[PDB]
Paper text:
Mutations in the human PURA gene cause the neurodevelopmental PURA syndrome. Based on the crystal structures of PURA from Drosophila melanogaster (dmPURA), three conserved sequence regions termed PUR repeats I, II, and III were identified to fold into globular domains. Whereas PUR repeat I and II assemble into an N-terminal PUR domain via intramolecular interactions, two C-terminal PUR repeats III from different molecules interact with each other and thus mediate dimerization of PURA. All these PUR domains belong to the class of the PC4-like protein family, which mainly bind single-stranded nucleic acids and can unwind double-stranded DNA and RNA.
Numbering used by the authors:
A (entry chain C): 57 to 91, 98 to 127, 142 to 211
B (entry chain D): 58 to 127, 142 to 212
C (entry chain A): 57 to 128, 139 to 212
D (entry chain B): 57 to 131, 141 to 212
The structure:
Amino acid sequence: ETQELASKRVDIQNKRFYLDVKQNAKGRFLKIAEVSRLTLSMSVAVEFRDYLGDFIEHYAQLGPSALKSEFLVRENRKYYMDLKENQRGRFLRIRQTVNRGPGLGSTQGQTIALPAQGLIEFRDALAKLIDDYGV
Amino acid sequence: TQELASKRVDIQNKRFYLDVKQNAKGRFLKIAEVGAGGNKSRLTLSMSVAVEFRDYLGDFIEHYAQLGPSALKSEFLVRENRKYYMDLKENQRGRFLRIRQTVNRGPGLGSTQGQTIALPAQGLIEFRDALAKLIDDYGVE
Amino acid sequence: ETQELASKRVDIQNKRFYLDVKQNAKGRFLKIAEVGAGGNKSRLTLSMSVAVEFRDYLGDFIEHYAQLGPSQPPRALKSEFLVRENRKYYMDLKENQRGRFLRIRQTVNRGPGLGSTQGQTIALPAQGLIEFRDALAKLIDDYGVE
Amino acid sequence: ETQELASKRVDIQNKRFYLDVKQNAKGRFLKIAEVGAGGNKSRLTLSMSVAVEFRDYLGDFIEHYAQLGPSQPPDRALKSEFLVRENRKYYMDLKENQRGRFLRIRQTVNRGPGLGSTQGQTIALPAQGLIEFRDALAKLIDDYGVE
């Protein structure tokens, strides 16, 4: 039975993300729901934490007006991370795909969009779930 | 006293206006937090002073980005008759930069009262950027 | 009056540097600007004569950077100091968690740093030091004297 | 099958390079994927033994690049090296085009016809990143190599 060990809430402009660390008898993993839904192993969650730091850095150094991308393939899942910008402002979009195993053949590629203002809070929340629970 | 330009910045559920203006003696910025505070929550900076302020924000941004999960930082700025107190704090609702501006009453006596804005830390990069643009525009070379 | 003689853009990671050669009645000189977030407080000034000595210092930082090997307040790896023509140039190779960089701070030189310094600072990501030295060397071959 | 032990991304100009340490039933090895600005991906595969030699060779390219001085006008590779270890060859050429110098590494089969585009198993490191790349490689070798 998958039982959540912790929830986390991050408010950014008028959007909300929940970071739930869950564990079924397979192991421990992270879920990230918007106001779609990513699922990450803790090991992959570490890579995100660090990549978020890369993104934060780049955003702080932009100054006034993709800007930056990362490409991650881990355990049958592929993650695209694009720091972009548009009329209303800068954001980080994260798309999760199945590129192998059960679930291939799609209708369900997952996506979340974080406003850039909240990357630091979102990274800080992730970091502490890693901190507490480890890999 | 000309209006030269405005820029608006929404941070979380709070709104700020950076307004450039000129009068003889020079150009200057007015930064207001929208609320019930009126002029109590509105700063006034010369252009010279805006630059030093922009740079201080650079430093607050760096401190905030490396806090990790958790006054955290204080800086200080005085020019002509005006003092600017900058304090990166955290209360239960999150991290913020409090800028309190004072007008010196005379040789070695602080104001009984000042004006103050509070920026949620998640908005500092936006704020800094809006301010940087207006500085690049409205008085160099 | 100031003639604009030449201009060179050097892109290094997510930074852009401009090297402008100018000339006034006193002689030829460089202005070196870093673009972005910071202001025109990221503006170095150097006669051609001093730009030569700066090029040579950059060769030593390049050697040191190449010999660091993999990494591990901020750690000061190599510091050098150039004072010339009533200006002081501090050159510190440093590293943080996010990479290695050469920070150059220019001040106006009176006594043992007495008055207003006029702290102009640029920060070259270390990756770019050879590109930067090279652009500078070209401008010196083209516009310097002997 | 293959387990993923460690990753490191090096940003050089508008490209990215992923150095991945992996292990299969036979061996531990390194995959190096270049991602171009436009989406182009290409890669090398190195045994950990070979990465040591590649890292050493990078040191030679670094020394050469640092000593070049700026591109002079025309009047071809500025420097070539060659690496052969059993079933894989690697052609290392330091070149320049209008946008800079770069180290092309081109991996081929040693015995076998070959398969796939030559570009898909070639990478081009902008020379500016040789030091950071060699350093990131040196670290992965330190922390997951036995050699």
